[PDB]
Design an enzyme around this catalytic site. Structure first.
Site, PDB file in Angstrom:
ATOM      1  CG  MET A 243      -1.815   1.227   1.373  1.00 48.89           C
ATOM      2  SD  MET A 243      -2.746   1.692  -0.138  1.00 48.89           S
ATOM      3  CE  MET A 243      -3.366   0.019  -0.714  1.00 48.89           C
TER       4      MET A 243
ATOM      5  CG  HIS B 168       2.660  -7.750  -1.716  1.00 52.53           C
ATOM      6  ND1 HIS B 168       3.213  -8.103  -0.504  1.00 52.53           N
ATOM      7  CD2 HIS B 168       1.638  -6.912  -1.435  1.00 52.53           C
ATOM      8  CE1 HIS B 168       2.544  -7.512   0.469  1.00 52.53           C
ATOM      9  NE2 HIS B 168       1.582  -6.786  -0.070  1.00 52.53           N
TER      10      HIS B 168
ATOM     11  CG  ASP C 283       6.037 -10.458  -0.933  1.00 52.18           C
ATOM     12  OD1 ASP C 283       4.845 -10.231  -1.261  1.00 52.18           O
ATOM     13  OD2 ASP C 283       6.376 -10.773   0.230  1.00 52.18           O
TER      14      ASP C 283
END
Lengths: 179, 179, 179, 179, 179, 179
Positions: free
Chosen positions: A84, A108, A157
């Site tokens: 985020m 991710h 990731d």
């Protein structure tokens, strides 16, 4: 008299997004954002970012306010912008998104977890896939990257050093020295 | 003997399914079923059931051992039989599924939950949904109801006294006094 | 005198692998196998499996005993055989591995977690990629799949029906009704 | 008989060293060795090993008991043998030390730590260092590698597959199939 | 004799699909598959694909023809396999599809056009939408991907190297050297 | 016999690649290539090249076939070999690639074009670039020239006479008189 350092930096129109992204701390960035619009809906606003991500909806409250408000919102990520944190970063106004030399970025996919009846589970699961996707579209749009790349690069990731986030469209350049 | 009470009762080919279903109790039940079938492939087996439900897979290792062993399996719900426990009960040898007069059955849909990425939330969501389908089918099977009636009446928790049990197909008859 | 029910089944050369795999349960299952081979090194041995997985080192303790002993080792799956659970189920004697009608199998890759210095972190990650490597091969061996398709298939949680189990070549056939 | 599967296998001169190494689990194996030596000091005692390591004094009580008793103690590794487990596995009678195909080994240096005054910190620091020096010496001696190759490879965690373990001279061969 | 070179490879059951896919060449390819099945219905058929694609119904006669004949049609792509080419490439027998090292795949959606009254146009836009859906489905089946994933991925021309084809699930692996 | 000159010289395992590279002429070359290996996979194959270039993919189907069949493929440029003619020439067996005395070679980067929406133009430009690189890598690989050197040398058409060709690493030697 540097009584309150951040309040003081809010007069230079600078805001700090640090750590866990969650409703309250998010709300405090919104409230700042709006406050600056009014104090002067014409000058640039500064959002420094060093965070590992967090609850999305809270994260989105910031995002929409960055678009919603009149002023452009410049973003500078220091230390780290992940998940985020990478999102709000690349959501800065185009040409005004930065990376200090050794800051590092990570992307991710939406993470979550529901519990309950099969019926309810499909509901919340369908929902997280919609969000997973919107977040990918909004990311495709701010980065200039295809929905294929994002989709692939965000399934797991994925890290980017300062040079690479520039090279990816996430931020526009690397601020090396205040010249 | 009375040295070990559950043992003696076993010599009569009577097994107990008590409390929650979970891998280990299920297993002990499965061994007793395998063992008794090897004591007599033709002698009807009896399994009382007082459970509030439990782990599906675990229950499902009982069910398959049920429809597998040579002998017939008569089930007697008592106290109660819920979720997985309602399943196995209404899964006994056709014509040998009872209920005491005041015991009570309760059915519903599968429960579950997962934490992780959207991508995995999905894998795990499609699954329970599939697992849901097969369950409504067997229930549809061993009872008589159509899939649909089942699919529809399991979304939410549903109570049934022994009477309605019978009137539903879950149990065949209602024991009252032995003779 | 059918004292411990599991002892009684052991005299029947039958072995149960229930629950989380870990050194001790594993040590117990391994000892059962040796003892049986000693009783009669020529007769088959039966391994019931209903596990959600567990420790790889402990599961491999089993794997190597299975392949080591003279007696073929027939594996049957009730409830579930997931992860190391599934690896062992497929590790049986070709031809004698089964899936009860409603059992379900699940495969995926090695899970890990280490804490330390970059240097040590690398010695361990490197190591688990090898374990992940040797694992996928053994899997390609037992299932008749290409190493290629194995890895590509285990990167994320993959669920398999009994039908799919047999089709994948993960188990030869489905034990159905006694005969 | 089989009322106790480990007592039974004990009668075939097999001893299991399983899990963490520590005084009581260690002292049981020491006692089983003195026992087996008593029933006959001529037949080889077979010690399986599936351990992640543990306390050094506790491992050294097993090490010494091993060299002392007359029966050759032959070691077989299943699952894994790390640290002290690797050490015991190799201190096995030369010619009689084996690894099963997929059991993995691991050597490293002693772990420890003190707390209190400087004089005491020095005293124990010196002591762990003297313990480390004898350990590599013994490892050297038993595996037949240079006390330096050993001083070296044990500095950080170091993994050995079953074959490398043979190459390194830790075990003597690999056990695959009963023949 | 090497009078006609393709008539020669056809005796080794090799079939070439080259260039634009359209009714007549498609019909020639179908006829060879039928003829090969007549000769020996057990032996595999190799289809070499080098095509930018073409007409959908023309290609579907090959698709169904492939699936209908007894032999497994093994597909090998050289040069490229785009549109109807990538499709027929992936419709080849599960496990027996490949891409030469430097061949490249491209997938996308149906293309077409109509001229006419609003009422005729609607019957045609509806139809190409149903064709669109069956291709996505058939693509989902054959690659193993999920419907929406296939839909999402085809909206625009997507290139895929052979490695990406193997990952994605169009082909089974990359042929590099005859052995 | 000399009924068909090209078929006759096919018996001496000779193959000609004349004119522009396009799918059909390429296919006829690949098939003769497969045909020869099939007649004897040990003897060398001779591919005479006198072409100005052509469709990249068409060419690659030929390339990958050259590297794939067991027969070694000896390349012999006559007249000229530019672009994809240059590439397939320097692609024959190391040691077995030539150049008639007055042959002429030309090298350079890919050519291409597209029409459409910004989005789709991106996808196709993105692709002819992935291809360029790969094409260069492969040139480096076959001439042992620096990867960077090829990038430079192929930004603009560069004519190379036979000696310069030999020197540049494109071909090994020059044939002048049949000794």
């Amino acid at each position: 008299r540097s009584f309150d350092i951040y309040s003081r930096l809010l007069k230079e129109r600078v805001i700090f997004l640090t750590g866990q992204v969650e409703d309250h701390m998010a709300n405090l960035i919104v409230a700042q954002m709006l406050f600056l619009e009014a104090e002067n809906p014409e000058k640039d606003i500064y959002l420094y970012i060093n965070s590992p991500g967090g609850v999305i909806t809270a994260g989105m409250s910031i995002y929409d306010t960055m678009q919603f408000i009149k002023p452009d919102v410049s973003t500078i990520c220091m230390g780290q912008a992940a998940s985020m944190g990478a999102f709000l970063l690349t959501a800065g106004a185009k040409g005004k998104r930065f990376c200090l030399p050794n800051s590092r970025v990570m992307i991710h996919q939406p993470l979550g977890g529901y519990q309950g009846q099969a019926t309810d589970i499909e509901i919340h699961a369908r929902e997280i896939l919609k969000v997973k996707g919107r977040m990918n579209e909004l990311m495709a749009l701010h980065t200039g990257q295809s929905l294929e790349q994002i989709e692939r690069d965000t399934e797991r990731d994925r890290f980017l050093s300062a040079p690479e986030a520039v090279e990816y469209g996430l931020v526009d350049s690397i601020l090396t020295h205040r010249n």
